[PDB]
């Protein structure tokens, strides 16, 4: 079955580092330099064996064709109003990038406002972030090339969609917030660094600053408004209060849902914005999240997790700011996570809750917090919303496993608040009625009950005969909720597959306690939860080890790679996308320093001892038993993934191929594909998305020998 040879890869046996007395050899450390001839040759040789492997069987072509057909459906974002105009994003079906449209009224003819597709041949220039001026007459937008986190901000006058000369460089992980006087916009930039800043570099990102750009000037004239030179990892994002009176500064360090909150009454500036603002340090620690919802004069409504792991709404009066004085507007729910809150039509609050990994949406009174209206939803997720304080209507977008979903509209000026379907699209070829979604709760090793969604064709016999695709993430307070995936439904329909999503600890599904259950000393909980999910699917007859594929990306790539090391006997196939593989060195590169709040840092003896136990790069080991080998493994990364630098996957695949791949009993392939002009994934053009899923399921089909079902 394996008709290729793994490439020659030099081992630097002298590359030995001492971590608190524990010696670690890193023979592929040289793969950390993306620019070397050695690394470039390594990538070329690896792609040279992977691509022919993926493309040998006609299944790739059948899948690609079906994906191209089925993914070709109209894709809309919610309408949103800015000034006197409406905007929405729309893809006719197969455009590489969705297009931003404008209309002068809801019944008015729409026209193209911003079309990213004309910015490159291959759709690899993508919108990343945008902000309209308060009056809706000016527009700032970020552009990222080749999938990099790096942004260039450009500007337009909305009337006539006129290009303006303003260009902002060195923007990354940035806010965009216009002052309501329409003079300029806050944003973040990083200082100059040696070498490249295009997404191919690994340089750590420190000393992010907050600037104010006056429209009509050169970037070099921009005002420095906040900086933290004594705290190089701090990141301060600005937003304007709804009345335009205050700049709110949310300072973060790491990835925990916490922030400092400082404010600036702009009217108290001595002569407008001219330098470091007169910041008032309302919350000056990282003990809780304070997410601005709205204010009425000095009374500020925040979504918080302070003493409230499932989140709640509090009012803090800037004139009486001590914690003991804060008012609880909407108390914490016992179990349901308050995901997000928006203020609309002056005195309404839109609250979105997560109840057992499904969304609900409710309208509350701002003055009392009292529930006023429940917006009815089927089982699934709210993935889009519009309606700001001055707006008198909302739009919201619902999606689920089995249908692309619906945009709803609700006119909030009406006495009876009845939502109506505004836009709905169905995909011909995938009849939702043929499939079912079930939710179960399985006990993990320590007895903790974990949610899992299972999607499958109705009427299947649970005889262990079905191929299964089990997805997980498990970290960073991210909740993995139902979403429409054409690519996964093709696996079900055309490969006879069962889909599963395990809501393992580390995620946000049951609030901050769920998140804390899968981080730091307890990261092993994630891997245990995920392995127990696999065991559930097997025990209950959905699948069998040899027919089971697991998949995850980034922190999810770490998840599946670790599970391959820990329980190789459990899985037939592993697809790890853009994964964090070197847990000892992740903090050294680009923004990886931010992830130590979930993982710890190997600089600490205590943390090193957690990390060394599960680090994928450091736990590649031949299975003891003669009858057990590693699952088939495919690593996917890209050369501009500056979120998770590709060296992670490069070093990991060299290690897999050397330790496991050289062994006689290993007949399952261990492969990497490194894409070009792509990065971590956000903004990836449609054409590349299609290639990627075609690669993924062709890999599964070849390794598990699955026949296409027409």
């Amino acid at each position: 079955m394996l008709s290729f040879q793994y490439p020659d890869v030099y081992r630097d046996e002298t590359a030995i580092q001492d971590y608190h007395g524990h010696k670690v050899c890193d023979p592929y450390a040289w793969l950390e330099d993306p620019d070397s001839e050695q690394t470039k040759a390594f990538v070329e040789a690896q792609n040279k064996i992977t691509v022919p492997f993926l493309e040998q069987c006609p299944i790739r072509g059948l899948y690609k064709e079906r994906m191209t057909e089925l993914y070709d459906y109209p894709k809309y974002s919610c309408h949103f109003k800015k000034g006197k105009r409406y905007f929405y994003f729309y893809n006719t079906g197969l455009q590489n990038q969705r297009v931003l449209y404008v209309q002068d009224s809801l019944e008015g003819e729409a026209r193209v406002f911003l079309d990213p597709n004309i910015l490159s041949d291959d759709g690899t220039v993508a919108l990343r972030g945008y902000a309209f001026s308060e009056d809706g007459e000016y527009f700032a937008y970020g552009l990222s090339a080749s999938g990099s986190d790096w942004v260039t901000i450009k500007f337009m006058k909305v009337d006539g969609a006129k290009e303006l000369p303003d260009v902002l460089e060195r923007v990354k992980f940035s806010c965009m917030a216009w002052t309501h006087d329409g003079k300029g916009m806050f944003y973040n930039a990083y200082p100059q660094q040696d070498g490249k800043s295009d997404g191919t570099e690994t340089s750590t990102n420190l000393h992010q600053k907050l600037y104010y750009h006056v429209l009509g000037t050169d970037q070099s004239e921009d005002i420095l408004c906040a900086e933290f030179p004594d705290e190089p990892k701090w990141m301060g994002g600005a937003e304007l209060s709804d009345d335009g009176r205050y700049v709110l500064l949310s300072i973060r360090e790491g990835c925990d849902p916490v922030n400092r909150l400082w404010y600036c009454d702009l009217q108290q500036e001595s002569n407008g914005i001219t330098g470091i603002l007169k910041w008032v340090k309302l919350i000056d620690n990282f003990e809780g999240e304070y997410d601005y919802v709205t204010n009425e004069g000095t009374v500020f409504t925040f979504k918080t997790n302070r003493h409230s792991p499932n989140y709640r709404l509090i009012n803090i009066d800037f004139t009486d700011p001590e914690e003991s004085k804060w008012k609880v507007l909407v108390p914490e729910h016992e179990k349901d996570v308050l995901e997000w809150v928006a203020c609309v039509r002056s005195n309404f609050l839109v609250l979105c809750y997560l109840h057992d990994v499904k969304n609900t949406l409710q309208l509350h009174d701002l003055a009392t917090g009292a529930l006023l209206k429940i917006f009815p939803l089927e089982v699934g997720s709210v993935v889009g919303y519009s309606g700001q304080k001055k707006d008198t209507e909302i739009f919201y977008q619902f999606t689920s496993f089995l249908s692309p979903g619906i945009i709803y509209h609700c006119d909030l000026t009406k006495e009876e608040l009845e939502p109506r379907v505004f836009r709905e699209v169905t995909v011909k070829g995938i009849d939702a009625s043929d499939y079912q979604t079930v939710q179960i709760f399985y006990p993990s090793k320590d007895g903790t009950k974990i949610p899992m969604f299972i999607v499958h064709k109705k009427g299947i016999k649970l005889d262990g005969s079905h191929p299964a695709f089990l997805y997980g993430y498990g970290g960073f307070n991210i909740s993995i909720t139902p979403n429409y995936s054409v690519s996964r439904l093709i696996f079900v329909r055309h490969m006879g597959g069962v889909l599963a999503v395990a809501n393992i600890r580390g995620g946000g599904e049951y609030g901050e306690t769920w998140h804390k259950g899968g981080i730091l000393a307890n990261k092993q909980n994630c891997f245990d939860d995920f392995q127990c999910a696999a065991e559930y699917l097997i025990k209950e007859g959905y699948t069998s080890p040899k027919r089971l594929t697991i998949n995850g990306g980034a922190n999810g790539g770490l998840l599946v790679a670790t599970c391959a090391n820990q329980r190789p006997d459990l899985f037939g196939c592993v697809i790890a996308q853009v994964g964090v593989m070197d847990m000892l060195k992740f903090h050294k590169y680009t923004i990886g320093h931010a992830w130590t709040t979930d993982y710890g840092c190997s600089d600490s003896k205590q943390h090193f001892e957690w990390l060394i136990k599960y680090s994928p790069l450091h736990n590649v080991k031949l299975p003891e038993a003669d009858d057990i080998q590693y699952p088939s493994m495919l690593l996917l990364t890209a050369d501009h993934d500056d979120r998770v630098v590709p060296l992670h996957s490069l070093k990991f695949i060299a290690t897999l191929q050397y330790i496991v791949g050289r062994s006689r009993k290993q007949n399952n392939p261990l492969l990497i594909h490194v894409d070009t002009k792509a990065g971590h994934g956000a903004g990836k053009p449609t054409a590349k998305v299609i290639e990627e899923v075609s690669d993924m399921f062709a890999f599964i089909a070849r390794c598990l020998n699955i026949d296409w079902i027409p």
Binding site: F476, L558, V578, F586, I591
Partner: peptide, 4 residues
């Protein structure tokens, strides 16, 4: 959004 700077999580992995």
């Amino acid at each position: 959004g700077f999580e992995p």
